[PDB]
Amino acid sequence: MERKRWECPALPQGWEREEVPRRSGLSAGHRDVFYYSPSGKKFRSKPQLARYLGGSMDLSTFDFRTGKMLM
DNA sequence: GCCAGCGTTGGC
DNA sequence: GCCAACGCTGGC
């Protein structure tokens, strides 16, 4: 349960994926997933992400939780 | 019963 | 006033 962040190969150049495990409360150990644009904007849901990227690329099979396209 | 999506807010 | 961190909940 450590924070990890680096490049997401399923998104365009400069986009990054991050996992932050929750450390307390009822949801402790749960891992939230975020994405960061090249400009550093923080995304925490697929609808949010799709408003920035959904025109420039196909996101219909992108799995926000895993960060990969569903084959 | 799980979890995507997002509401809430203590601590700053 | 912001926002990381966690809870809530509608849809499945």
Swiss-Prot record:
Phosphoserine PTM positions read 56
Q: Show the segment(s) annotated as Required for interaction with MBD2.
A: 1-71
Indicate where this protein resides in the cell.
Answer: Nucleus; Chromosome
Residues covered by the MBD domain: 1-71
Subunit = Heterodimer (via N-terminus) with MBD2. Component of the MeCP1 histone deacetylase complex. Component of the nucleosome remodeling and deacetylase (NuRD) repressor complex, composed of core proteins MTA1, MTA2, MTA3, RBBP4, RBBP7, HDAC1, HDAC2, MBD2, MBD3, and peripherally associated proteins CDK2AP1, CDK2AP2, GATAD2A, GATAD2B, CHD3, CHD4 and CHD5. The exact stoichiometry of the NuRD complex is unknown, and some subunits such as MBD2 and MBD3, GATAD2A and GATAD2B, and CHD3, CHD4 and CHD5 define mutually exclusive NuRD complexes.
Q: What does this protein do?
A: Acts as a component of the histone deacetylase NuRD complex which participates in the remodeling of chromatin. Acts as transcriptional repressor and plays a role in gene silencing. Does not bind to methylated DNA by itself. Binds to a lesser degree DNA containing unmethylated CpG dinucleotides. Recruits histone deacetylases and DNA methyltransferases.
Q: What is this protein called?
A: Methyl-CpG-binding domain protein 3
Q: Gene behind this chain? A: MBD3
Q: What stretch of the parent protein is included here?
A: 1 to 71 of 291
